[PDB]
Amino acid sequence: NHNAQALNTLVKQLSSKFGAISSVLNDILSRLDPPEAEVQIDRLITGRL
Amino acid sequence: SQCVNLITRTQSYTNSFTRGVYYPDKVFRSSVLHSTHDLFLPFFSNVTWFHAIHDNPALPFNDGVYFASTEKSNIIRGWIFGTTLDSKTQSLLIVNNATNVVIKVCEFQFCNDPFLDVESEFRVYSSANNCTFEYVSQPFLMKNLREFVFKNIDGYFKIYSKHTPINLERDLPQGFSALEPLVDLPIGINITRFQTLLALHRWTAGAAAYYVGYLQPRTFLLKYNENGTITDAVDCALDPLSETKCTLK
């Protein structure tokens, strides 16, 4: 059960925003300036790390 | 005068082994293993052997060009790069002789088979009218094999060159020989095809042979010995063993 719960929590953690405008990379890429979308991707990368 | 057609060409294929390695930057390193991602010549691939004897020498340029010449009579000199080889677009006119090299970017009206009278260029282009880019420097070409690498990135044309003595061999040798940069220029034009120039005295029968290859974006692992030179390289996209070696560094 410990392993199952840990894996489930790790999967569930992917839906967080971490202070960005969205939790989906495609929306950020399609809605923002390429030189500006980097500061949004950085937060997601740091949170997932 | 006017354009004339007098050159014929034949083709063959051969193997490249491990050739076409150049220093990626002007930084000194020693006793290290470095990883680079750049346009390189893949190991163990087709390279085309062209034999010109006296024709559509407008070969594609693609990302980059690797040129190899093993002759001695100095029959080879200069290059042309462009997209349509007409007066409607600008093109390169690299020309070499025993004293100087002149690089010109204009809207030349190239002939089907350009060459030198030998020392005039009326056989190359009819005329050039409107242009800006001109450059003059020391000539590039100075039992020996000469290797050249031409590429362009973000409007910058970069050339690498190397000379290496070779013994009596009918194919490319085995080993490693790094290339050093010589020229970087602000070209800022569109390049799709390229050609080759020859100097013919008067005419007279002529023969030449060279090797042509194409570059691709690849990741390489280079080994710098304690002495500043590159002595070994590993291509990380050749076989699973090389990928494992690159992963383990």
Partner: protein
């Protein structure tokens, strides 16, 4: 705490402080011709933009404010106030004239007619952009027509790419055959400039300055005096804008003629080449160490 028990404690580290400062710059005596780039009383069209190369001169950017009546700089990789200290390899100056509302299109990662058909900037651009109004010089009561821009191109332009070919653009399957009939158009249109237009439709002169980082021997930078060279001492050094502190010693490394710097495993400069005398030097951090204090109880 005000009381210490018996034992040994690690307190701090000792280091050796520098003695003086060293500046080494190459022989440059000419002045960069920034004057000729501005006040040229003739600016090329956006679709055919001029490009001037600046090298082997001393650059004094503070005088640039005296040539054009612009408001402020717009730099990306550097700061306007720090331009007098860095030393580059080559400088490139581009100049053209555009409309008022298109000035925002001259920036990395931009999209628009001018961005993809006339002038494109790389996503890793390092330079400055200076734009200023020129309504008193590029406007006529009847309407100026000497400035043109390209409308339709088959593909998007690459960074720092120029297009001059004038042809008949085709929009259908039938060939144009060099006539401007249906589904065949001209590729260039002229701006309509009048002095009675709004601020967003008035002509604007734009100059872009592009710099090159230190990969080759430097040629362009400001008027900084060069001092003598000292060795075997803990000193501050400044080699062509590369600043640091340490001890400089003679080097036994065999640099290739096209190499100028030496790096180590941790990506730090450890070998340098003097700009004036082509000599190789090694840099070593000054002496340092850790200090421990041994004491019994304070009672």
């Amino acid at each position: 705490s005000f009381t210490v028990e018996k034992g040994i404690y690690q307190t701090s580290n000792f280091r050796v402080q520098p003695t003086e400062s060293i500046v080494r710059f190459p022989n440059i005596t000419n002045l960069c011709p920034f004057h000729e780039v501005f006040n040229a009383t003739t600016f090329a069209s956006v679709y055919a933009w001029n490009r001037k190369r600046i090298s082997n001169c001393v650059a004094d950017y503070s005088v640039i404010y005296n040539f054009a009546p612009f408001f402020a700089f717009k730099c990306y990789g550097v700061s306007p106030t720090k331009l007098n200290d860095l030393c580059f390899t080559n400088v490139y100056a581009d100049s053209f004239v555009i409309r008022g509302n298109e000035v925002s299109q001259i920036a990395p990662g931009q999209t628009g007619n001018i961005a993809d058909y006339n002038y494109k900037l790389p996503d890793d651009f390092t330079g400055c952009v200076i734009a200023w109004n020129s309504n008193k010089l590029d406007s006529k009561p009847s309407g100026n027509y000497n400035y043109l821009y390209r409308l339709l191109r088959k593909s998007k332009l690459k960074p720092f790419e120029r297009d001059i070919s004038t042809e008949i653009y085709q929009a259908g399957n039938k060939p144009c055959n060099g006539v401007a009939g249906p589904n065949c158009y001209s590729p260039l249109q002229s701006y309509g400039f009048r002095p009675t237009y709004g601020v967003g439709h008035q002509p604007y002169r734009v100059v872009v300055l592009s710099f090159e980082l230190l990969h080759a021997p430097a040629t362009v930078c400001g008027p900084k005096k060069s001092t003598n060279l000292v060795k075997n001492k803990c000193v501050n050094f400044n080699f062509n804008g590369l600043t640091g502190t340490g001890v400089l010693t003679e080097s036994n490394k065999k640099f290739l003629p096209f190499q100028q710097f030496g790096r180590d495993i941790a990506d730090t400069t450890d070998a340098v080449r003097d700009p004036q005398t082509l000599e190789i030097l090694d840099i070593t951090p000054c002496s340092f160490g850790g200090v421990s204090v041994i004491t019994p109880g304070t009672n």
